[PDB]
Each structure stands twice: as C-alpha cells, then as structure tokens.
C-alpha cells in the first residue's frame, strides 16, 4: 500500500480493521483505506469480507461507495474505498433550514438509482437503512451514496430463495418475516420505509415489542 498511496488520520477502527484518510501520491487523489489486520481475521469473517469485496468491485455507480483497489501485504490486506465526508443523509437533513418533498424525492431518486444498479448486477443489499445512506461530502449538493454491503447477497437473475433472516427490524420485509423465499423486492420495501421517514420523520412501523412490530 505505502508502495503507491500514503496514509493519514484515522477515520475509525473496528475489531479487525482500521480506516484512515489516504492519498494516491502518484495522482493527487484522496481515498479511504480500510486496513485489515489479517492476523485477527477469523475464517467465517474471512468468508464475509471476500464476499463484500467481490460485490463492491462489481458495482461502479455514482451513488454507490466505490471500491477502488484491493492489495495484500504481510498479514495486512488493504481495501481502498471512496472518501465519504458528508456523513449520514438523515443527519444532514435535520441541519437544513429548508426541506420539502422535492428534496426527499431527489434523495430517493439517487437511492433508487443505486438499488436499481445493484439489482441489475444480480445483487441484493438486504440492509437499506439510514446508517447506510451517506453524503459524498459536505458540499451543498453532494451525492447520496449507498454504503456497507456486508449483508449483500448474490442472486441468480430473478430466482427467489431463502438466504436467511437478516436485516434491521424496522426495515424487514413481510416475506422475510413470513420465512418465505425472497429476493430483490426486499430492498424496495426498505426503500418504502425510508421514503415514509423522509416525509414525516417517524417510521411507519414501530412498537416496543418486536413481536408486535413484526405483526
């Protein structure tokens, strides 16, 4: 990595990963480097990171966090993502002095563009939620970017199947809760939940008891 790029400040750190602002010195760029201490990565975690990188390499779209490079070293693998500075879309909205349906529609248009790109490439995100809707920068008109494909699956065309009970409760689809085979439409249900929230600021399904929520 240091080979070509250059590391800087830390933007975060997980259990096996540390993320830092980076720069491709040869081209004066600026990316986010996900530095993985491969010596701490388990076998099942190794299986999921291989899936997330393969999916991210396959998705090239303005409204999707782009994986720019993957390279290994001595027990330390590097993943170069786009640098995202604008934080959560939902956090930006509360700071705005004006916000209308037109603003919400412009947001959902971008989210739908990313979801459509995922689906067109046989990929289902399965965890669309506010935490995964980021703004590229703090610029006045920064682009909405879909992030974190750690729960994303690879589907065969339009074939439905049971890929497991995964997602965030408030955004889970009826078909997953019914334990039915499912596919791309689960993301569109989540979009509908997000759109509802973008208009009035509270969720369409909410309950202290999760069982009641799922009903």
């Amino acid at each position: 990595f240091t080979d070509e790029y250059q590391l800087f400040e830390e933007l975060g750190k997980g259990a096996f990963s540390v993320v830092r602002r980076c720069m491709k010195i040869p081209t004066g760029q600026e990316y986010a480097a996900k530095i993985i201490n491969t010596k701490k990565l388990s076998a099942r975690d190794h299986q999921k990171l291989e899936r997330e990188a393969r999916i991210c390499r396959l998705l090239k779209h303005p409204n999707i966090v782009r994986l720019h490079d993957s390279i290994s070293e001595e027990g330390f693998h590097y993943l170069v993502f786009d640098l995202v500075t604008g934080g959560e879309l939902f956090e930006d909205i509360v700071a705005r002095e004006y916000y209308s349906e037109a603003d919400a529609s412009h947001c959902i248009q971008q989210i739908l563009e990313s979801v459509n790109h995922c689906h067109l490439n046989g990929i289902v995100h399965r965890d669309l939620k506010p935490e995964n809707l980021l703004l590229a920068s703090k610029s006045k008109g920064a682009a909405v970017k879909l992030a974190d494909f750690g729960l994303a699956i690879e589907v065969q065309g339009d074939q439905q199947a049971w890929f497991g009970f995964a997602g965030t409760p408030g955004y889970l689809s009826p078909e997953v809760l019914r334990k039915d085979p499912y596919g791309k439409p689960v993301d569109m249900w989540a979009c509908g939940v997000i759109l509802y929230i973008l208009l009035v600021g509270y969720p369409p399904f909410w309950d202290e008891d999760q069982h009641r929520l799922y009903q």
Binding site: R44, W162, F163, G164, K179, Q210
Partner: protein, 223 residues
C-alpha cells in the same frame, strides 16, 4: 369423550335393549351434574322399581361374551405399580412436530444457520447449559456456535431422538419433549456419548411451524 358425553348405543346389541334402560343411562350420563339423576330418583325409575314389567328377561349372551373379554383386559392392565409407557402411535399432527424438530436438529448438526433462522422464531428464547442458567433471547447467542464450531470442527457425530412426547395445545401450537443422545469422537479420537433433555415449543405462524422457545438440560450440544 367423557367431557363431551360422547357415547352412543350402536346396533345390533343395543337394538334389543329396552328404551327404559337406555333412558336411565341417559339420565345418569348427563354432562351437567346439576341435571343428573340422583340416587334417590334412580331408585324410583321404572326400570329399577318396576323391573318385573319394564326390564327385558331375554338372555344377552353377547354381553356375557364381551364381559369375559372386558374382565380379562382389566386383569391384564391391573397395574400393580406406576407404569409409564412411551408414545408410538402418533397422529399426523404430532408427526409434523417431530419432523420439523428433526429438521431443526439436522440444521444444527450441519451448521446451516439459514435453515435455523427459517425454522426458529426471531423472538426465540432459550434455557440451555451453554447459557449458564440465563434465559437468552434472539438468534445472537446461537449464531456464535454456527459461525464457529458447528461447521469448523470436522468430526463425525450421530444424533438419536428417544421417546418423543408431543402435546397439541391448539390448532397452531404444540410442545415436544425428547431425549437427545449424541455419539461423537472426543479429542483423543475415542467414541463418546452424551445426553440432553430438550423441550421445544412450536407455534404455527404464516403456515409454518416455528420454534419460539426451547429448554435443554443435561449436556451441552457442542461436544
């Protein structure tokens, strides 16, 4: 059957019984005890106090022959001691609970978390030795054993389900209790066996039997 008063007088044997004898039976086998004939009243029933004119005097050989069998069975079933016999003649409904239970155990043995989360309710609770006397909720606690041991370890294991007992508690709810015998290879490569006792509560939701709670005692399922 008793609570429903579900008895009848099948032909042919009852075709030759007098109406008055059937009447007295009906008044004794009245579900509502407030409306049941009393001992004083029965002693005045025509079949009792006017037997000479009411009760038949025909010989009932088929009653004698049947009583012989009744008595013989009664003397064979005479339990001198408390005897507890397993269940082996299962309805289709009870077999359904056994099947989905074995599908769940199979998914655990094969480390198939997708099947596990399909069969188990998201709000599943559990008592198990792995949980050290705590009631655990959700899939998190169980996810650890799938993501690691259940597929990581490469050793042969054989599960046996002994003496399952199924309670049907409504059209969409059931309870199953069984002994879980597990044969496996230990660290030294020697064969071992362990036993657990397991209760699983099942609720039919969206047309699918789903496990909402289970209780394991004895050994922990991971060797």
């Amino acid at each position: 059957q008793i609570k429903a008063g579900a008895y009848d007088f099948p032909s042919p044997e009852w075709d030759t019984v007098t109406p008055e004898a059937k009447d007295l039976i009906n008044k004794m086998l009245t579900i509502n005890p407030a409306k049941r004939i009393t001992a004083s009243e029965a002693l005045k029933h025509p079949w009792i106090c006017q037997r000479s004119t009411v009760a038949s005097m025909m010989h009932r050989q088929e009653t004698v022959d049947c009583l012989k069998k009744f008595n013989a069975r009664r003397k064979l079933k005479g339990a001198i001691l408390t005897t507890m016999l397993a269940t082996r003649n299962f309805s289709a409904r009870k077999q359904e609970i056994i099947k989905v239970t074995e599908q769940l155990i199979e998914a655990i043995n094969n480390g198939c978390f997708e099947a596990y989360t399909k069969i188990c309710d998201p709000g599943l609770t559990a008592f198990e030795p792995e949980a050290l006397g705590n009631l655990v909720e959700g899939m998190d606690f169980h996810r650890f054993y799938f993501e690691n041991a259940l597929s990581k370890s490469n050793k042969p294991i054989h599960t046996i389900i002994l003496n399952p007992h199924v309670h049907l508690v409504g059209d969409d709810a059931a309870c199953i209790a069984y002994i879980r015998l597990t044969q496996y290879m230990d660290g030294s490569g020697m064969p071992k066996t362990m036993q657990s006792e397991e209760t699983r509560v099942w609720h039919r939701r969206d047309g699918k039997w789903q496990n909402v709670h289970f209780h394991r005692s004895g050994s922990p399922t991971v060797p």
